[model samples]
Target: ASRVFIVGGHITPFVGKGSPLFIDKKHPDFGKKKNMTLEEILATTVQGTMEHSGLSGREGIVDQVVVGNFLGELFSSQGHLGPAAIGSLTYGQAGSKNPLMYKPAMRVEGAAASGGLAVISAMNALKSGSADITLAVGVEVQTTASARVGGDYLARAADYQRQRQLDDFTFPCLFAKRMKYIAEHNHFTMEDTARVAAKAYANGNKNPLAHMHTRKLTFEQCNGEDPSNVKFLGNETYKEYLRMTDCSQVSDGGAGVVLANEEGLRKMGLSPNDSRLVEIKSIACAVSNLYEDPDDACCMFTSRQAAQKALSMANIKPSDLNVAEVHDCFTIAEMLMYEALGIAEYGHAKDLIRNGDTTLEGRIPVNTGGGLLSFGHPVGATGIKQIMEVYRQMKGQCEAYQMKKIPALGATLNMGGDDKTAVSAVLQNI
Candidate 1:
């Protein structure tokens, strides 16, 4: 198989309508962006990425486009949308016909990991010689009223048929239930989980593009001790265990990557040494049964399997990872990911948090971009965002959050819905 490299990528500031960076209807700088649209956000992001890579949206420069969006139809009025629409809009704004005019364009959806799946699909296309250069893009706009209307769109990732039978089937409630299970079986504690959230917020505070960049949080707030911290659901038990600060933010954002094979890189007048490109050492995806009993559902099983597979393919161990970005949709999810990625032993993820091992200055920093919790979870865009962080960190472009040791390898773990889908990738700086 041919090697693949992520030459360039772009991520929009992860923010909602009320955020400072959000394109408000009345903002003086709104210009033509008075009202934001997914297509526009994606086009702008793609344009920026192409510009960064010196591609200029030129015809025949891109061989294929793979787009990812989890709730596009449910969040907005668009459905059955794919790469063609994205490519046409992006290139049209550049005063050109669809860059993907005669090329293949497709979309991949795996809930929250939709972006990661799209990337893996593009990598496969490159390996198979189906394409020399492919664009992997993930875009989502979830601030619309319709998207927030019944508060059930996020639950669609679960077993819809069975989830509908429950009283409150929101993701928080579902994860809360898992927290209870972990607490009972694995002796997990809310204190440790809150520490994880606090760490994420601290890291996010340093990340200018993070949705919660300006929102500084303390461990006390995450532990549900602060009077200002509120409970999400009415479940007293859930409140006792999980607080609002432990959850991820709802965001609207887009991220894109320009991936290419060796020939394509040469065509662009770039080489591994000159571009400092991050090589895709290995990537693996695994799935678990969504219908399994919540009590018996080992949420980390599939994630661990995927991570193990990726590491094996890369001929490296988890210990070799200088940094990592895992799916932190919730505090508990981050804790579970530590064990799944082999950074911590089973039932001992809290040790990593309590000892400050996951901090940027620690042995192995995790979620230096604040992860989904502080980075904002734009569903489909999250996976791509995670990979972008790894790429930047590996390239020593993370600035304040950059590892002092000059990381040689990094990994990203992106999960879809209740851990039903897991995608893990190992990246090495070349």
Candidate 2:
């Protein structure tokens, strides 16, 4: 078996529309004082991450590069571009004209988890003996695309056709409906959900990279006529219920990770000690079977199945994982994943939230990188971004929001297409 290690990774601060990101809506300027394009942000993310991994500007340190993107057709009007980006980045050599490097880079699409699945693809290549090292990047700039379609940012995530016909595609409205059902079924009050939102924002403050980090809100403020109370904010009560004090933001950003086989690690002079290695224990993917027909809009069956499979392959139990970065795309998504990941009983997710079991300092410490709520979900890069957060925690270099103790093992879950497709992986620190 091959021992695959993650060298390191980097990312830009997630920014939303009308902010720095919008300033660079197009013609992105890397490292400039403005919002950058997903492309430029991706290049910056890749370059910065490589630098941190101790492979800065060194030719041939990596053998390949791959990217994950879902809205390229919609955002950039470009597709099938795994190789072009790598060739442009000076990864292998400058003007060397190595077609192999161009050929080796490819794209992976899994809706929001596009980047996470891309990382899995590169790892698969190393496992197959095709490459020694690979760079996987994920990124998205949805705010611009959302405006082209109409309405605010959240609505862009839904089924626009259905929304056009029935107005059900509104993200906040849809999540609101899910929250009502979940709250009623679980006997939770609207106020309880508000608590979740407060927690999310607070956690976001801890994450310097988060998009919405400055202001803090309370249950009263969340349920009050404040801007967040607008129905467009979705299940405001539940959305603001958690203690992290922030939910993932809708913004633009990119994330990239480097992978290497044992031989490649040796070539890079990255010994097990020198390298902050996080092993890829296993990965399992499942597409949601709508036929199962669960009442909740977010499907936990796929998530549960994926988690179980990955854990089994890694020969570990849910209890073995000290922390995780889950796909809390929505408050309900977090609620569903809490149960899906087996962190709480079916009806006990609300209890866990109240008990602070998943808080940064809690027993499980979930989404310490602020999960999607703060990091800002840039679709193509969202999944890989989640994995990057887990990597930061595992290395104990989380900066201000460092965990009390880094877990030797962690997991990441990414889903796409209205929860139809899901991927789960267990990461180990050796």
Candidate 3:
């Protein structure tokens, strides 16, 4: 019986255009390339977790490695990622010449769910007797390109050949269509979406790791009346819905997680109930057609399916969750999740949205450190970032962003490509 557990992990500081860490000519980190390099970000990320788990790649305790990514060459600065990481993740000094080489490291890709897929693949490796210890990393070192080019680069997530004609910003255009359909059905107002944005920034304001952490917002500015929010009226890809405030900002970041089995844990003098261990109750990845339209526009079908399987596998219900980190790539996605996960009834997510239910003080606080809308969506990194936040929350280690009480059960929903693929997992403290 190979029951996988997360022994240790690290998440790079999420830096985006909105974050104080964002790159600009005036910013201190502009040319330093310290946190910006793929090797350094990947290197520093796994190093922290290596320190946490007490594993030495020099002795070959790390059985396998998985890195999740999208747009590496142009955006994150690497076309050859696994080897780039292997050297950085190698143990010992330069002259020592560690042998983490030729160990079956894999580079996983599935658009945004690249991170989620990486973690799940690690889980499978442990379960399949392939390896006992695995390192799963996810990253999207953006902020290198302008939004104009960024939009074109990101459009590959969907059916590129077919979708490029619809909109250059293919993903945003799809979501706007998602918003437009919901609006026609009276699902919620454009203003309601703004509330989600306001809530996100509020949570981000308290999270040092968030891309928008330094940026504070009021409902007034989020309501689309502020000059900044109003400036994009006619220029935006989608008219009558989804302003800049409602979208996820571009960002650069990555996360590293060390997954191990029972033997791997005992090898380090730890038990299943080790206080440092967070049990992986259940994790699932579900995929739907990328090119087809959902039967229902108001709900995300694949995400719903993934949530059901993940919850059922964990033998838990939504209400049993004390905390959650959902894919709020945009505010509407969060609102829909309330319904998709059955936390609220269909077309009734507005109830939870209007009330204070999903806030930090709510019965079930969601995205305590801001979701993608504020925390930063580093594409591949977001999925892993969700687990990192949930893990930190369970440990009561969030510091300023810590919840009023530690969560015993939590869930993370990471989606990719207009609900084309979804990875849902439930985790809890021992």
- What is candidate 2's local distance difference test score? 0.70
In model 1, the runs with Cα more than 4 Å from the true position are: 23-35, 57-59, 83-96, 146-150, 167-169, 235-239, 294-299
After aligning candidate 3 to the native by TM-score, how far in Å is the CA of 111 from where it should be? Answer: 1.1
TM-score of each: 0.93, 0.85, 0.95
lDDT of 1 by residue, 1-430 (tens): 5888989888888887446787666666777655457777777777776776668746367778888889888778776556544564454456655545666877789889899999999999888988888888888888875433535788878887876444253677767878888888865688888999999999988888888888888898888878878765655665555677878888988888888899888888888665468898999999888887535433578888899999999999988888999998889899999989988888778888999988999989999988988989988888888888888887788887787887888999999988889999999887
**Decoy 2 TM-score against native:** 0.85
Residue 250 lDDT, candidate 2, scale 0-100: 63
lDDT of each: 0.81, 0.70, 0.82
lDDT of 2 by residue, 1-430 (tens): 7867887887678777423334553536644655556567666777776777777657456777888887766666667767546654554355754334534677877667677688878888888878888888887776665542523333444455554332423444455556667656664545555655666667777777777665456657644536645443333454433322223566788887888888888888877555378888888888765324367643468788888888899999888898887887765677778778777777777897888888888888887866676566777778887777888888888887888887888988887744656788899976
Worst 10 residues of 1 by lDDT: 83-92
How many residue pairs clash (N, CA or C atoms closer than 3 angstroms) in each of the candidate models, in the order given?
Answer: 0, 40, 0
Residues 1-430, candidate 3, lDDT per residue (tens digit)?
6687888788777886666676676788778754466566777776776765677644377888888888887785577677766776653467666567778787888888889999999999988888888888887877777777788889888888877666666677778878888988998877788888888999999988888898888877887777777423332546667677888878888888888899878776788989888988899999988778875779998999999999999999998999888888778888888777767778987888789788898888888888988888888788888888899888888888799888999998988888988999999787
